[PDB]
Paper text:
The structure of CpPstS/phosphate complex shows that each asymmetric unit contains one CpPstS molecule, and each CpPstS molecule binds with one phosphate molecule. It consists of two domains, an N-terminal domain (NTD) and a C-terminal domain (CTD), linked by a hinge region. The phosphate molecule is bound in the cleft between the two domains. Although no additional phosphate was added during the protein purification, crystallization, and data collection process, clear phosphate densities were observed in the resolved structure. Structural analysis revealed that seven residues are involved in the recognition and binding of phosphate: Ser32, Ser33, Thr34, Thr61, Ser83, Gly174, and Thr175. These residues collectively form 11 hydrogen bonds with the phosphate molecule, anchoring it securely in the cleft between the NTD and the CTD of CpPstS. The most significant distinction lies in the absence of a critical hydrogen bond interaction contributed by an arginine residue. In E. coli PstS, an arginine exists in the corresponding site of Pro169 in CpPstS, suggesting that CpPstS may have evolved a distinct hydrogen-bonding network for phosphate binding. We systematically searched the PDB for all available structures of PstS proteins in complex with phosphate and conducted a comparative analysis of their substrate-binding cavity with that of CpPstS to gain insights into potential structural differences. It was observed that CpPstS has a significantly larger substrate-binding cavity compared to the structures of C. perfringens PstS, M. tuberculosis PstS-1, E. coli PstS, and other PstS from different bacteria. Structural comparison reveals that α-helix 9 (residues 229–236) near the substrate-binding cavity in CpPstS rotated approximately 20° relative to the corresponding α-helix in the C. perfringens PstS, M. tuberculosis PstS-1, and E. coli PstS structures.
Here, we investigated the phosphate transport system in Candidatus Pelagibacter sp. HTCC7211, a representative SAR11 bacterium, which encodes an ATP-binding cassette-type phosphate transporter, CpPstSCAB. The high-affinity Pst system was initially characterized in Escherichia coli, Streptomyces lividans, and Bacillus subtilis. This system consists of four proteins: the phosphate-specific binding protein PstS, the membrane integral proteins PstC and PstA to form a membrane channel, and an ATP-hydrolyzing protein PstB to energize phosphate transport. Conservation domain analysis indicated that CpPstS belongs to the type 2 periplasmic binding fold superfamily, which includes SBPs involved in high-affinity transport of soluble nutrients via ABC transporters. Microscale thermophoresis binding assays demonstrated that CpPstS binds phosphate with high affinity, exhibiting a dissociation constant (Kd) of 112 nM.
Author numbering: 24 to 224, 228 to 327
The structure:
Amino acid sequence: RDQITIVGSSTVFPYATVVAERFGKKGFKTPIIESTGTGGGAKLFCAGVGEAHPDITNASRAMKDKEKALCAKNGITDIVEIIIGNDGITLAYSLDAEPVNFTKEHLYLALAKHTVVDGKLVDNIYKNWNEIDSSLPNKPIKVMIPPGTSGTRDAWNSLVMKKGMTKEAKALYKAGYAAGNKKYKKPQKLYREDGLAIEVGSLIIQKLVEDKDMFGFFGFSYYLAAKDKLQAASIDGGQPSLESIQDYSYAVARPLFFYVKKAHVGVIPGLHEFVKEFTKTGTIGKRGYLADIGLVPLDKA
């Protein structure tokens, strides 16, 4: 094989694509890149050490212990982690609607599998944002959530669900878990399944345009490209921006990664050279060509 193979995060995908396109003009073939999702990419990367398996998986959250364990089992223990920059998960919606600010708790309450009612966990009873907080708009809850195995789902679970989770809910889940419910050990993973938090799967933008009350998830680069049609909800009083993502004042700032199968260096031509190209200051630094399309570079202060 003489072409580099890259799988993984859809958040990282547009960035790795630009690097690949430039790379293809420097005496190597243009790498092959698939947008498979962080978790789907990790599974593929970790399937085996042979050339039939991907050289690189992109990730919008760190590799998980379960994933490292699979890799190890299939003989991949030499993995290089590269942090390319940052993302801000953006909760976008149609420009035709009013600006809005949701706290992390607001978001948790709307999306959660359960509402605490009379000291008991029951299926989510919130149908309108204004029920959760009278300061929120009278607007039905309609959210398109990322895929279950996506890194964006994982990061939202960690940064929003876990943190927005109420003390009261936490205690009920902990007690249910202690009493034997294994699914309640990590309750931040649990979303309502009554159609108000529908799993997603270009057309997200279209669906948001079609229903101004609907909200959706976007990696920052995708939101920026769509600003002619979409705006961002404030989260904890803050909008996503280069500055707020870079200093992590933005509440859903997050790092972006890719992982390199070291064994394939020296087997697949250009693999190391591609990594060095991606890691150049002119690529991922301030004013680099990835910053020009929305990558928030690592703060170097």
